[PDB]
């Protein structure tokens, strides 16, 4: 089941010295103090500045791994881009703020926001799903 | 899902050209894992005939025996390999050869000074007789039954103008060469192709319009016919992509920094096969495919 959901307004897409991956700085359109940094490979999910993304962190996809076979359903069908990683840090920026660091096979996400609506993310293997 | 039929529907072949020595064709919608298998089998697995055993009786030229036998082995022979069988290396060297698996070549030649050479002449062919030993000098000695099997077509070198040796008067060369079957994996002389290889079809994605005189220089950064100028509007477009040798002169200018991306089509192989002379490139490709198939079949039939 889900653990987080929000709508983000991408501020910058920064390529760096890479080809496929890019750095996304996205601010939440629902919370005054929730922002995001994420690394996705824009060869698969190309993103431009001043866009809108539906970011969802889920504990699972069911409604080990194995390629899909005819007659399979999963949560990912609602989203275009889904990465799988894990959390490795939980930093408190200040009082009533918290940052949670995810690493999707080396692809790094630093999700920050108020503790009130981030209080469902813990050090487990969590999926990340993105939608336009 | 991938199936035999799902591959057979999309796979297609375009034979761009075909001589008796070079055949340039295409394999589309196939994987590199199989295109490279074909290339490797062509280069180093298709059997052919080359001289292996050399029996010098007398040699006095500047060329030493090892170098001479090496050159004689390197000479391609216009023999269809199907006409003869393989050799058992376990058998004794007396009976290791027969008339159905060994082709015998001889080279008996003696140089002598020509008495009719004009004064002041320096041409070696005028001064001396048999001053040059050519591959055409390799006579064929049909033995046993092969006298009538090879009667339909005599054995000759693929290139009879190969310069095997040079002689000066007094010097002679006398030898017999035994030619057997072999594959390029053992020795590079048995490989039937001068070079067999493929190249991914270039792909030129023009990201942005290039109207104006910028198209003239854009096309100028490519082989002559790769890019065309549109007749209606002054736009640039890709006429033929096979014509492009990937030189990346476009990226050398700051103008087209964000106007084009050069890539490739990973399922589109422009095969190019050139034969040594013993077989034809279409038969080389056919032999390679049959070899891969029979190898897989041998593995199937292999008990486990």
């Amino acid at each position: 089941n889900t653990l987080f959901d929000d709508i983000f307004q991408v501020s910058e897409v920064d390529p760096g010295r890479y080809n496929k991956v890019c750095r996304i700085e996205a601010a939440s359109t629902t919370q005054d103090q929730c922002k995001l940094t994420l690394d996705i490979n824009v060869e698969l999910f190309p993103v431009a500045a001043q866009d809108s993304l539906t970011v969802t962190i889920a504990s699972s996809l069911n409604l080990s791994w194995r390629p899909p076979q005819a007659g399979d359903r999963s949560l990912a069908d609602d989203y275009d881009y889904v990465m799988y990683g894990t959390a490795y840090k939980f930093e408190e920026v200040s009082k009533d703020l918290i940052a949670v660091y995810y690493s999707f096979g080396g692809l790094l996400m630093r999700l920050e926001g108020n503790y009130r609506n981030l209080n469902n993310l813990k050090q487990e293997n969590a999926y990340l799903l993105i939608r336009r | 899902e991938w199936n035999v039929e799902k591959f057979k529907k999309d796979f297609e072949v375009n034979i761009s050209s075909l001589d008796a020595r070079e055949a340039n064709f295409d394999l589309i919608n196939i994987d590199t894992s199989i295109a490279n298998a074909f290339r490797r089998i062509m280069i180093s697995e298709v059997p052919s005939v080359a001289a292996e055993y050399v029996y010098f009786f007398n040699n006095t030229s500047v060329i030493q025996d090892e170098v001479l036998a090496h050159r004689i082995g390197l000479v391609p022979l216009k023999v269809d390999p199907d006409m003869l069988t393989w050799v058992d290396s376990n058998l004794p060297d007396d009976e290791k050869f027969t008339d159905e698996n060994t082709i015998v070549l001889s080279l008996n030649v003696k140089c002598t000074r020509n008495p009719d050479a004009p004064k002041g002449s320096t041409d070696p062919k005028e001064l001396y007789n048999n001053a040059h030993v050519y591959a055409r000098d390799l006579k064929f000695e049909p033995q046993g039954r092969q006298s009538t099997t090879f009667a339909d077509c005599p054995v000759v070198p693929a290139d009879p103008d190969i310069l095997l040796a040079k002689l000066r008067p007094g010097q002679e060369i006398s030898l017999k060469a035994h030619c057997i079957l072999g594959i390029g994996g053992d020795h590079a002389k048995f490989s039937p192709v001068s070079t067999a290889s493929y190249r991914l079809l270039p792909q030129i994605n023009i990201l942005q319009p290039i109207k104006g005189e910028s198209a003239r220089r854009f096309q100028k950064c490519f082989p002559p016919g790769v890019i065309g100028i549109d007749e209606g509007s002054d736009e640039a477009y890709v006429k033929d992509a096979r014509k492009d040798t990937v030189s990346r002169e476009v990226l050398r200018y700051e103008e087209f920094a964000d106007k084009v991306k050069l890539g490739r089509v990973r399922n589109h192989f422009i095969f190019n096969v050139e034969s040594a002379g013993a077989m034809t490139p279409e038969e080389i490709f056919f032999k390679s495919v049959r070899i891969l198939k029979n190898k897989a079949e041998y593995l199937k039939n292999c008990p486990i």
Binding site: - | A35, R39, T195, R199, S247
Partner: protein
């Protein structure tokens, strides 16, 4: 060895099919590790391979007496213009493919002829 003190023992005789092949069908007869250069710093071997490829193409020979090129008339620019005017790459690189698997290698390989 080359003519630039780049000695090294022949490690293995690589099979031709296993050797990387280029888009023009040629397989190098010598493979030299790129890591030989950063410490030895024999840039002469680079510029010689460039000029040797250009000369083998055009059917010419290029003099390599020292001090004909200066800080303006760079040998890289000279032999690169010569390489481009024959269809090849200005930097001497060649798209090559791996002969072991079959796929194209990540970057353009630097090839040429050296003595």
């Amino acid at each position: 060895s080359s003519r630039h003190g780049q000695k090294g023992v022949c490690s293995r005789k690589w099979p031709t099919i296993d050797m990387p092949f280029s888009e023009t069908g040629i397989q190098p007869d010598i493979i030299i590790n790129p890591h030989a250069f950063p410490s030895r710093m024999t840039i002469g071997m680079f510029v010689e391979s460039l000029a040797g490829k250009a000369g083998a193409l055009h059917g010419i020979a290029q003099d390599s007496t020292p001090w004909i090129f200066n800080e303006d008339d760079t040998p890289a620019d000279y032999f690169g213009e010569q390489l481009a005017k024959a269809g090849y790459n200005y930097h001497g690189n060649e798209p090559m493919y791996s002969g072991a698997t079959g796929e194209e290698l990540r970057a353009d390989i630097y090839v040429g002829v050296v003595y």
